[PDB]
Amino acid sequence: DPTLEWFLSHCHIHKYPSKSTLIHQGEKAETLYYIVKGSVAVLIKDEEGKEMILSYLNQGDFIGELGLFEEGQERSAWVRAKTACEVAEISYKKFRQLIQVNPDILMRLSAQMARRLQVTSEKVGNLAFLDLTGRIAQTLLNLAKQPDAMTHPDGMQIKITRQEIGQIVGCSRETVGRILKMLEDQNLISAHGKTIVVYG
Amino acid sequence: PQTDPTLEWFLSHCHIHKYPSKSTLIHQGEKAETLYYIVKGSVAVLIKDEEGKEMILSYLNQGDFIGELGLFEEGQERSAWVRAKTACEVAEISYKKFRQLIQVNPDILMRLSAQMARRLQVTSEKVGNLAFLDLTGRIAQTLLNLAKQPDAMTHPDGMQIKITRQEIGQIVGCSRETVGRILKMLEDQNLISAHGKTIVVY
Ligand SMILES: Nc1ncnc2c1ncn2[C@@H]1O[C@@H]2COP(=O)(O)O[C@H]2[C@H]1O
Ligand SMILES: Nc1ncnc2c1ncn2[C@@H]1O[C@@H]2COP(=O)(O)O[C@H]2[C@H]1O
Ligand SMILES: Nc1ncnc2c1ncn2[C@@H]1O[C@@H]2COP(=O)(O)O[C@H]2[C@H]1O
């Protein structure tokens, strides 16, 4: 793909080990990012520093776009590396120059913003219409319907930690524990082992 | 003072239609094949649960593109209902013709994309409020947002606003009664005065 190679040729590309922070919320935004390899988590936090994952992003994804269209904006979220990453970066000023040469690069950025806005709106619906209990339930259902969920004699099976569920949903690992139990005891699931079994 | 030549050039390739107050301009699930633009008026963007309760995702106003999320990949559906809040003049262009404008002058894309940006900051802050803010703080914050805003008013004790307990409830996600309950107690902690659809934020 010649457009992405052209584009990458004006970026500078760096490695970020697993668990490092690429973008801090409140920081001034004057650069765009792009995932050559790996995956990051876009996350937000409350007062007690509890986190919610707005989105996993993966190779081929732009990051830090939101400040590109009016100056003086702050980073809106935390981006942390989920695996080891290679991350291309370019300034808003250079990027606006690439957009003039070949506006298709803006077209591919805007395609992702659109998708991201559909996906974030779906997540507002949930937080508005489901309570925490339901959101944990739904989350497990979703993991169990992913291509990588493996098969089980009595339903579907997935390996996730109370911790990833806590981040997906906005509560602690211990609160996840209490609620898995409540879920076990209404027979929605069976969480014997670090593996969970989901049903029907 | 708030139109310009790029817009007018854009607007002149559109069919510009007038919609009454309360008409829905876009239905969720519809094949997205057309871009809209609010030449005058304001709209609510809405989603629903299986039980037909409504959540207001956003208000949009004159200047604002609508119906843009299908633009970049074909075969998509509208992700939300968009409903006229006042009487509206709204422009429409097919995606295919709009892709063509973007080649003529990419600046049209930069204006749309700016707006998608601001939309995702706002929807992301909303995701934060619903996950982390309590109901009463969410209402407190909504009142503050309406009050800080033109369409708001002026008053001896602050700004004053017009909004029923139901639209409130649709913005924060709670019933009308609960809104009424929380408004009262917000009255008691000296934060507002509330006479029906009309509120004085201090
Ligand atoms: N709802 C979301 N989904 C995916 N990515 C997001 C979302 N909200 C913010 N981001 C990304 O995280 C970045 C944080 O820095 P910026 O706001 O500059 O740019 C932001 C977007 O790239
Ligand atoms: N979170 C949001 N904030 C503002 N506008 C939105 C949001 N989600 C959807 N929309 C608008 O609602 C429109 C519904 O149809 P589209 O998905 O074609 O285009 C959508 C966007 O313009
Ligand atoms: N838990 C909830 N989540 C989201 N929206 C709600 C909830 N309860 C009520 N609403 C919506 O917000 C509206 C506020 O006024 P009503 O109670 O008339 O109708 C309400 C619903 O349409």
Residue numbers in the entry:
A (entry chain B): 9 to 208
B (entry chain A): 6 to 207
What does the paper say about this structure?
Previous studies of the ligand binding domain of CAP demonstrated negative cooperativity between cAMP binding sites in the absence of structural change within this domain. We produce coarse-grained models that describe global low-frequency protein backbone motions of CAP and show a strong correlation between negative cooperativity for cAMP and modulation of the delocalised normal modes on ligand binding without a requirement for a spatially distinct physical pathway or conformational change. We demonstrate experimentally that altered connectivity between backbone elements in CAP can give predictable alterations to cooperativity for cAMP binding through altered mode amplitudes.
The V140L mutant protein had no discernible effect on protein structure.
